[PDB]
Amino acid sequence: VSLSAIKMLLGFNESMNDISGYELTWTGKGFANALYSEPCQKQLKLQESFTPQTSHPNNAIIIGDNLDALKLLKSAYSEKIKMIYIDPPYNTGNDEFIYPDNFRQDYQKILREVGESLKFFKNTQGSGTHSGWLSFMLPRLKLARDLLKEDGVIFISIDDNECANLKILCDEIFGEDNFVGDFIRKTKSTTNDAKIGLNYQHEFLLCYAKDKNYTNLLGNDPNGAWINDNPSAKSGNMKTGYFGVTNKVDYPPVGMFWRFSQKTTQKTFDSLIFSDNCYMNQAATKELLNLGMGEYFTYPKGVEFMKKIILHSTTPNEGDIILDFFAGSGTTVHAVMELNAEDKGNREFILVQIDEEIKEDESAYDFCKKELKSAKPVISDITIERVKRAAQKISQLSKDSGLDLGFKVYTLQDKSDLTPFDKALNLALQCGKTLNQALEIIIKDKLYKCEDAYFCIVCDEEAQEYLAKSKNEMIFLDGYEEIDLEAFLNLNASFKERL
Amino acid sequence: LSAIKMLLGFNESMNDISGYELTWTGKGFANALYSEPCQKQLKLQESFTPQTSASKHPNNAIIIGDNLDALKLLKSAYSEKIKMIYIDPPYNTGNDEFIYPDNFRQDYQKILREVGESESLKFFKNTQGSGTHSGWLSFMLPRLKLARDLLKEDGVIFISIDDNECANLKILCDEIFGEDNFVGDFIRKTKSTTNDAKIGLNYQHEFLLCYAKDKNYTNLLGGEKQKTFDSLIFSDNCYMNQAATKELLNLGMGEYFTYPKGVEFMKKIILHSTTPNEGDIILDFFAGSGTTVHAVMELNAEDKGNREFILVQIDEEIKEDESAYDFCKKELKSAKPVISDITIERVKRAAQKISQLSKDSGLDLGFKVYTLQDKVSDLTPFDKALNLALQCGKTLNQALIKDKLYKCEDAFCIVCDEEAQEYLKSKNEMIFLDG
Ligand SMILES: Nc1ncnc2c1ncn2[C@@H]1O[C@H](C[C@@H](N)CC[C@H](N)C(=O)O)[C@@H](O)[C@H]1O
Ligand SMILES: Nc1ncnc2c1ncn2[C@@H]1O[C@H](C[C@@H](N)CC[C@H](N)C(=O)O)[C@@H](O)[C@H]1O
């Protein structure tokens, strides 16, 4: 209710955007940055442990908003992730994007400034607009950066609708100097929307380094750091590769052929490697068709595509962790497990997928109900199932039992429906221990032990105190549980911590 | 410092209502320079014709000077008239870093209407020095706005660019042409194996952005407007940098321009964005080595089309350590070696070789060189009249009483006295007069 010569205000604002400098602004950016600093409200709850009957699994799938997962993982994975890959929602005309964080309680708590005029900003931010999509991506990218090791990188798939906004957002978050580069993937051969004579047939894969100084994307008689690698690769040397090597006849693993026959070794990541017909959308569709989940996931990425990203951004034999927090059909872990089996590596993975209702009219709905024992069909149901089937089919073909296709499923509960185990695993997470660090040994529904530290939940001076007559190891108590005085004090000295 | 707390806060609150926008230092002055009246006029410098076709007036033009002043000056006659623009502006890379030039102009008069040097001005030019985005965007804005004015309803603009400024460019064109009028982007493979792979990356491509004046009226098929324009067509080895440098070598100009585009690349662009027989005009106001018009000539000569071009090229002084210096000052006998010299010699050599291969009397390979003088005194009467005709809607393609009166189509005179007074026979001509 004021005077339309507010050009005063609009002038002062614009001149201040000049003084403030180069920056991509948009409606709601201020709150998106505040959501990033809010405490974490969630806790992990164990749900399932899948093995494929071989063996505690080094891999993990978390169900929930990736905003909550990442906040939760920060307590133990700050500067621990080797690579992040995310295929987020493009903000196309077709599947157009609604800003979800409107609804979060901590966002409405963040909106304590004024719960009236808010109607105008809702329309301005809106649906299919850039403001909503960018607000959504900001806090999650910031957290993703927090989880990267210094030699870590993040890849993000994107199309024309938000490529440029994305690149500029990542510049602001990761530092423009840490832009590694962009990869082009060919998506199709012929277009069907050739309305103006253009056959638009590609998308983008942006790569940012946490610290580009440490980035590397390459692919005598005494023992040394050579440790000769696999003599077989997934190649095309059918006849000139399937043959025979104390007597024992060695033949190459099936689906793979010998690298021999009856500086010039490193490979660079080429910015156009994915412009080849191999990485088109057709390839992914046939992959999920063949897992029987083709009715249920409409736009997966492709395995050989993901396999190459992983191969260039990770090492085979150092427990590199791969995080994908926009999982979808789980193509990333299908790639990880499949590459790990090929070079006999130990890559670990963390997957995140929100649990959004599948609508009744979708084919996956009945599949979830009937085939997947599910009360309310969620997208994570078929995420998990695709991973199961891939792990199961890799397991059948691969023989190495020192090869880990299992994972554990976790959900996110708002911070008494927690097991003692959930309570203890949450305390160990809050204490630096990670999801792969051996599912802490059980000791009597009250005390648990991870790596070489114990985690105490029902500090009733049972053998709890008598076992804790073992010195030289850190003891953590859950300070939000109930706790007996005499036991606390008798546990006298100083390598103890209540949290 | 406590007062700043709401200043930066009122700003955030104002940006929320302002909405989505790419901002940078000096965008406001960049938009004001667009609106400043044109300060220059044209002076004929040369007329070239390859073979004895003797087509006294070529329909093709080359303008030496600042594309900013050029487009402002073409805006009268050539508004909504250009069919396809192509520009390969400076990329603002790390080595060939880009300095903002426009703050040596009537940007001074604009800053005089503001506060003038004065302590505040030393703040804006410091935050906008050397290879910043802000200087490059401020530079690109007014010229891109003018480029839009000249495109016709069915016009498109193509802009080459690399990773340094792609995203900034895409967002700047969205604001100028409308996001809906974004056509698509094309990918050109640049090389096979890169200079140095410091981090194991082999970065081998660049971008070609396409915007339409009005995406409703655009057609990028090949014929008379069927074969589509594939967004990955230039990812083939055929369009790498080595092709282009191979062509300058073949014209004897290998040592004289550094990173030229390639003829086969520009040809396919012209083929998809223009009809062969309709007088479509191609405008390229970052001429460089003039690959663009080499391509439209070579293309007109195969399907016998009538496309016309307009080149603009700044007359930047070449320095004595660059080999083209000795070349311009002797071979081209230029008093001052400027990049436009080698622009025009490449166009000439290509017109020659194409002429010597053609058997077509009526294929137009010549052009006129115009220069841009501030005077607004060193203008011959025909130049005085050329500007007169130019501002009344007559195109440079159109040809204009012995130093007294001129007739471009059914119309102009500089000295309006006796001889012309009786010359009023051709009643109903609506002839124009100067001031
Ligand atoms: N807040 C969120 N947290 C976690 N996942 C989300 C969230 N929002 C959307 N997603 C999911 O991220 C996925 C986006 C997909 N494009 C991912 C594709 C996946 N790479 C594939 O190959 O199928 C969808 O499954 C989304 O439901
Ligand atoms: N204000 C300006 N007005 C006209 N030309 C300019 C201006 N600034 C830079 N240029 C020139 O535009 C050209 C940019 C080049 N990259 C174009 C190369 C050209 N497409 C080729 O194939 O060789 C350079 O020759 C610049 O000197």
PDB file of C-alpha atoms in Angstrom, chain A residues 4-174:
ATOM      1  CA  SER A   4       4.161   3.649  -7.525  1.00  0.00           C
ATOM      2  CA  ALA A   5       7.134   5.982  -7.755  1.00  0.00           C
ATOM      3  CA  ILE A   6       8.810   3.152  -5.812  1.00  0.00           C
ATOM      4  CA  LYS A   7      11.324   3.447  -8.636  1.00  0.00           C
ATOM      5  CA  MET A   8      13.330   4.915  -5.778  1.00  0.00           C
ATOM      6  CA  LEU A   9      13.375   1.454  -4.185  1.00  0.00           C
ATOM      7  CA  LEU A  10      13.818  -0.373  -7.483  1.00  0.00           C
ATOM      8  CA  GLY A  11      16.644   1.989  -8.421  1.00  0.00           C
ATOM      9  CA  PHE A  12      18.424   1.584  -5.088  1.00  0.00           C
ATOM     10  CA  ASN A  13      18.021  -2.174  -5.425  1.00  0.00           C
ATOM     11  CA  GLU A  14      19.423  -2.349  -8.949  1.00  0.00           C
ATOM     12  CA  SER A  15      22.409  -0.114  -8.188  1.00  0.00           C
ATOM     13  CA  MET A  16      23.118  -2.339  -5.196  1.00  0.00           C
ATOM     14  CA  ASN A  17      23.054  -5.424  -7.428  1.00  0.00           C
ATOM     15  CA  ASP A  18      25.730  -3.605  -9.467  1.00  0.00           C
ATOM     16  CA  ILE A  19      27.909  -2.797  -6.437  1.00  0.00           C
ATOM     17  CA  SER A  20      27.337  -6.273  -4.974  1.00  0.00           C
ATOM     18  CA  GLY A  21      28.682  -7.685  -8.244  1.00  0.00           C
ATOM     19  CA  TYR A  22      28.154 -10.665 -10.497  1.00  0.00           C
ATOM     20  CA  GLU A  23      25.524 -13.028  -9.078  1.00  0.00           C
ATOM     21  CA  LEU A  24      22.555 -15.056 -10.345  1.00  0.00           C
ATOM     22  CA  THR A  25      19.619 -14.098  -8.089  1.00  0.00           C
ATOM     23  CA  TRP A  26      16.148 -15.645  -7.937  1.00  0.00           C
ATOM     24  CA  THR A  27      13.027 -15.623  -5.791  1.00  0.00           C
ATOM     25  CA  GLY A  28      13.556 -17.484  -2.529  1.00  0.00           C
ATOM     26  CA  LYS A  29      17.348 -17.927  -2.739  1.00  0.00           C
ATOM     27  CA  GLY A  30      17.563 -16.383   0.734  1.00  0.00           C
ATOM     28  CA  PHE A  31      15.512 -19.127   2.351  1.00  0.00           C
ATOM     29  CA  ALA A  32      17.203 -21.902   0.369  1.00  0.00           C
ATOM     30  CA  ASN A  33      20.469 -20.890   1.981  1.00  0.00           C
ATOM     31  CA  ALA A  34      18.869 -20.866   5.441  1.00  0.00           C
ATOM     32  CA  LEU A  35      17.416 -24.378   5.032  1.00  0.00           C
ATOM     33  CA  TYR A  36      21.062 -25.476   4.597  1.00  0.00           C
ATOM     34  CA  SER A  37      22.013 -24.356   8.124  1.00  0.00           C
ATOM     35  CA  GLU A  38      19.045 -25.851   9.956  1.00  0.00           C
ATOM     36  CA  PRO A  39      19.856 -28.693  12.373  1.00  0.00           C
ATOM     37  CA  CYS A  40      19.092 -32.246  11.346  1.00  0.00           C
ATOM     38  CA  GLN A  41      15.768 -33.502  12.694  1.00  0.00           C
ATOM     39  CA  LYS A  42      16.022 -37.105  11.513  1.00  0.00           C
ATOM     40  CA  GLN A  43      17.514 -40.395  12.697  1.00  0.00           C
ATOM     41  CA  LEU A  44      18.360 -43.657  10.924  1.00  0.00           C
ATOM     42  CA  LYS A  45      16.276 -46.803  11.448  1.00  0.00           C
ATOM     43  CA  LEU A  46      17.439 -50.168  10.098  1.00  0.00           C
ATOM     44  CA  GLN A  47      14.903 -51.748   7.746  1.00  0.00           C
ATOM     45  CA  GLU A  48      16.473 -54.685   5.877  1.00  0.00           C
ATOM     46  CA  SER A  49      19.809 -56.358   5.131  1.00  0.00           C
ATOM     47  CA  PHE A  50      20.171 -57.918   1.695  1.00  0.00           C
ATOM     48  CA  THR A  51      22.983 -60.361   0.934  1.00  0.00           C
ATOM     49  CA  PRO A  52      22.240 -62.382  -2.217  1.00  0.00           C
ATOM     50  CA  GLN A  53      23.393 -65.192   0.111  1.00  0.00           C
ATOM     51  CA  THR A  54      27.182 -64.859  -0.062  1.00  0.00           C
ATOM     52  CA  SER A  55      28.383 -63.737   3.371  1.00  0.00           C
ATOM     53  CA  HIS A  56      27.890 -57.081   7.165  1.00  0.00           C
ATOM     54  CA  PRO A  57      27.492 -55.082   3.955  1.00  0.00           C
ATOM     55  CA  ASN A  58      29.626 -52.070   3.036  1.00  0.00           C
ATOM     56  CA  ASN A  59      26.739 -50.536   1.096  1.00  0.00           C
ATOM     57  CA  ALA A  60      23.640 -48.668   2.118  1.00  0.00           C
ATOM     58  CA  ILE A  61      20.354 -47.328   0.768  1.00  0.00           C
ATOM     59  CA  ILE A  62      18.617 -44.525   2.678  1.00  0.00           C
ATOM     60  CA  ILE A  63      14.923 -43.716   2.122  1.00  0.00           C
ATOM     61  CA  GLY A  64      13.763 -40.130   2.539  1.00  0.00           C
ATOM     62  CA  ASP A  65      14.347 -36.603   1.329  1.00  0.00           C
ATOM     63  CA  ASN A  66      17.981 -36.272   0.280  1.00  0.00           C
ATOM     64  CA  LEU A  67      18.021 -32.992   2.196  1.00  0.00           C
ATOM     65  CA  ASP A  68      17.680 -34.992   5.424  1.00  0.00           C
ATOM     66  CA  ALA A  69      20.021 -37.827   4.443  1.00  0.00           C
ATOM     67  CA  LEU A  70      22.900 -35.515   3.537  1.00  0.00           C
ATOM     68  CA  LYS A  71      22.495 -33.509   6.741  1.00  0.00           C
ATOM     69  CA  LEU A  72      22.543 -36.806   8.629  1.00  0.00           C
ATOM     70  CA  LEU A  73      25.560 -38.155   6.751  1.00  0.00           C
ATOM     71  CA  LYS A  74      27.577 -34.987   7.431  1.00  0.00           C
ATOM     72  CA  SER A  75      28.296 -36.143  11.001  1.00  0.00           C
ATOM     73  CA  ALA A  76      30.430 -39.047   9.713  1.00  0.00           C
ATOM     74  CA  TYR A  77      31.130 -38.389   6.002  1.00  0.00           C
ATOM     75  CA  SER A  78      32.452 -34.804   5.878  1.00  0.00           C
ATOM     76  CA  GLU A  79      35.339 -34.998   3.384  1.00  0.00           C
ATOM     77  CA  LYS A  80      34.969 -38.768   3.007  1.00  0.00           C
ATOM     78  CA  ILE A  81      33.140 -39.235  -0.333  1.00  0.00           C
ATOM     79  CA  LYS A  82      35.232 -39.876  -3.429  1.00  0.00           C
ATOM     80  CA  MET A  83      32.459 -39.244  -5.943  1.00  0.00           C
ATOM     81  CA  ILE A  84      28.871 -37.999  -6.059  1.00  0.00           C
ATOM     82  CA  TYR A  85      26.669 -38.588  -9.102  1.00  0.00           C
ATOM     83  CA  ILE A  86      23.186 -37.103  -9.295  1.00  0.00           C
ATOM     84  CA  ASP A  87      20.611 -37.222 -12.099  1.00  0.00           C
ATOM     85  CA  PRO A  88      18.193 -34.664 -10.587  1.00  0.00           C
ATOM     86  CA  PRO A  89      14.861 -33.612 -12.106  1.00  0.00           C
ATOM     87  CA  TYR A  90      15.446 -31.601 -15.218  1.00  0.00           C
ATOM     88  CA  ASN A  91      12.889 -28.864 -15.163  1.00  0.00           C
ATOM     89  CA  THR A  92      11.328 -29.583 -18.559  1.00  0.00           C
ATOM     90  CA  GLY A  93       8.014 -28.407 -19.920  1.00  0.00           C
ATOM     91  CA  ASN A  94       6.697 -32.006 -19.843  1.00  0.00           C
ATOM     92  CA  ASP A  95       7.602 -33.293 -16.353  1.00  0.00           C
ATOM     93  CA  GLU A  96       7.629 -29.852 -14.784  1.00  0.00           C
ATOM     94  CA  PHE A  97       8.943 -29.362 -11.291  1.00  0.00           C
ATOM     95  CA  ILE A  98       7.105 -28.229  -8.140  1.00  0.00           C
ATOM     96  CA  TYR A  99       9.139 -26.739  -5.269  1.00  0.00           C
ATOM     97  CA  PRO A 100       8.771 -29.380  -2.502  1.00  0.00           C
ATOM     98  CA  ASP A 101      10.502 -27.564   0.359  1.00  0.00           C
ATOM     99  CA  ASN A 102       7.435 -25.283   0.673  1.00  0.00           C
ATOM    100  CA  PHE A 103       5.988 -28.059   2.815  1.00  0.00           C
ATOM    101  CA  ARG A 104       8.862 -28.958   5.187  1.00  0.00           C
ATOM    102  CA  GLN A 105       8.302 -28.018   8.820  1.00  0.00           C
ATOM    103  CA  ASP A 106      11.802 -26.559   9.227  1.00  0.00           C
ATOM    104  CA  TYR A 107      11.149 -24.456   6.131  1.00  0.00           C
ATOM    105  CA  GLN A 108       7.930 -23.169   7.674  1.00  0.00           C
ATOM    106  CA  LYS A 109       9.874 -22.657  10.905  1.00  0.00           C
ATOM    107  CA  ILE A 110      12.448 -20.767   8.810  1.00  0.00           C
ATOM    108  CA  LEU A 111       9.539 -18.643   7.521  1.00  0.00           C
ATOM    109  CA  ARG A 112       8.987 -17.228  11.027  1.00  0.00           C
ATOM    110  CA  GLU A 113       9.522 -13.751   9.517  1.00  0.00           C
ATOM    111  CA  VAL A 114       5.850 -13.606   8.379  1.00  0.00           C
ATOM    112  CA  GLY A 115       3.360 -16.490   7.989  1.00  0.00           C
ATOM    113  CA  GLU A 116      -0.337 -12.532   3.920  1.00  0.00           C
ATOM    114  CA  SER A 117       2.133 -11.295   1.303  1.00  0.00           C
ATOM    115  CA  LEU A 118       3.498 -14.866   1.225  1.00  0.00           C
ATOM    116  CA  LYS A 119       0.850 -15.620  -1.418  1.00  0.00           C
ATOM    117  CA  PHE A 120       2.602 -13.399  -3.978  1.00  0.00           C
ATOM    118  CA  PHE A 121       5.983 -15.105  -3.526  1.00  0.00           C
ATOM    119  CA  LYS A 122       4.397 -18.549  -3.919  1.00  0.00           C
ATOM    120  CA  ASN A 123       3.085 -17.559  -7.354  1.00  0.00           C
ATOM    121  CA  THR A 124       6.390 -15.869  -8.255  1.00  0.00           C
ATOM    122  CA  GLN A 125       8.502 -18.872  -7.244  1.00  0.00           C
ATOM    123  CA  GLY A 126       5.814 -21.189  -8.753  1.00  0.00           C
ATOM    124  CA  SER A 127       6.015 -24.393 -10.789  1.00  0.00           C
ATOM    125  CA  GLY A 128       8.238 -24.938 -13.815  1.00  0.00           C
ATOM    126  CA  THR A 129       9.990 -21.659 -12.987  1.00  0.00           C
ATOM    127  CA  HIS A 130      13.726 -21.503 -12.418  1.00  0.00           C
ATOM    128  CA  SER A 131      13.347 -19.977  -8.941  1.00  0.00           C
ATOM    129  CA  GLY A 132      11.764 -23.126  -7.514  1.00  0.00           C
ATOM    130  CA  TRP A 133      14.267 -25.513  -9.088  1.00  0.00           C
ATOM    131  CA  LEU A 134      17.303 -23.460  -8.010  1.00  0.00           C
ATOM    132  CA  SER A 135      16.041 -23.070  -4.427  1.00  0.00           C
ATOM    133  CA  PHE A 136      15.638 -26.854  -4.387  1.00  0.00           C
ATOM    134  CA  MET A 137      19.143 -27.556  -5.704  1.00  0.00           C
ATOM    135  CA  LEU A 138      21.135 -25.029  -3.582  1.00  0.00           C
ATOM    136  CA  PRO A 139      21.126 -26.495  -0.034  1.00  0.00           C
ATOM    137  CA  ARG A 140      21.612 -30.037  -1.373  1.00  0.00           C
ATOM    138  CA  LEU A 141      24.599 -29.074  -3.524  1.00  0.00           C
ATOM    139  CA  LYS A 142      26.163 -27.225  -0.569  1.00  0.00           C
ATOM    140  CA  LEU A 143      25.878 -30.361   1.571  1.00  0.00           C
ATOM    141  CA  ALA A 144      27.194 -32.567  -1.240  1.00  0.00           C
ATOM    142  CA  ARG A 145      30.288 -30.350  -1.328  1.00  0.00           C
ATOM    143  CA  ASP A 146      30.671 -30.822   2.446  1.00  0.00           C
ATOM    144  CA  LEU A 147      30.827 -34.603   1.966  1.00  0.00           C
ATOM    145  CA  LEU A 148      33.504 -34.636  -0.768  1.00  0.00           C
ATOM    146  CA  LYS A 149      37.115 -35.496  -0.028  1.00  0.00           C
ATOM    147  CA  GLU A 150      39.517 -32.921  -1.427  1.00  0.00           C
ATOM    148  CA  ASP A 151      40.262 -35.237  -4.374  1.00  0.00           C
ATOM    149  CA  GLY A 152      36.518 -35.865  -4.757  1.00  0.00           C
ATOM    150  CA  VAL A 153      34.332 -34.816  -7.683  1.00  0.00           C
ATOM    151  CA  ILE A 154      30.594 -34.462  -8.296  1.00  0.00           C
ATOM    152  CA  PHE A 155      28.856 -35.267 -11.602  1.00  0.00           C
ATOM    153  CA  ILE A 156      25.372 -33.924 -12.396  1.00  0.00           C
ATOM    154  CA  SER A 157      23.247 -34.830 -15.422  1.00  0.00           C
ATOM    155  CA  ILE A 158      21.154 -31.980 -16.839  1.00  0.00           C
ATOM    156  CA  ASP A 159      19.462 -30.907 -20.070  1.00  0.00           C
ATOM    157  CA  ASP A 160      18.992 -27.491 -21.755  1.00  0.00           C
ATOM    158  CA  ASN A 161      16.279 -26.155 -19.420  1.00  0.00           C
ATOM    159  CA  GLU A 162      18.647 -25.701 -16.457  1.00  0.00           C
ATOM    160  CA  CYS A 163      22.180 -26.513 -17.645  1.00  0.00           C
ATOM    161  CA  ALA A 164      23.238 -22.858 -17.553  1.00  0.00           C
ATOM    162  CA  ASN A 165      21.567 -22.015 -14.220  1.00  0.00           C
ATOM    163  CA  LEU A 166      23.117 -25.198 -12.847  1.00  0.00           C
ATOM    164  CA  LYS A 167      26.617 -24.326 -14.013  1.00  0.00           C
ATOM    165  CA  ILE A 168      26.349 -20.881 -12.478  1.00  0.00           C
ATOM    166  CA  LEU A 169      24.939 -22.253  -9.210  1.00  0.00           C
ATOM    167  CA  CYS A 170      27.765 -24.770  -8.927  1.00  0.00           C
ATOM    168  CA  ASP A 171      30.283 -22.014  -9.674  1.00  0.00           C
ATOM    169  CA  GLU A 172      28.927 -20.102  -6.703  1.00  0.00           C
ATOM    170  CA  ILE A 173      28.997 -23.188  -4.464  1.00  0.00           C
ATOM    171  CA  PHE A 174      32.114 -25.070  -5.586  1.00  0.00           C
TER     172      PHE A 174
END
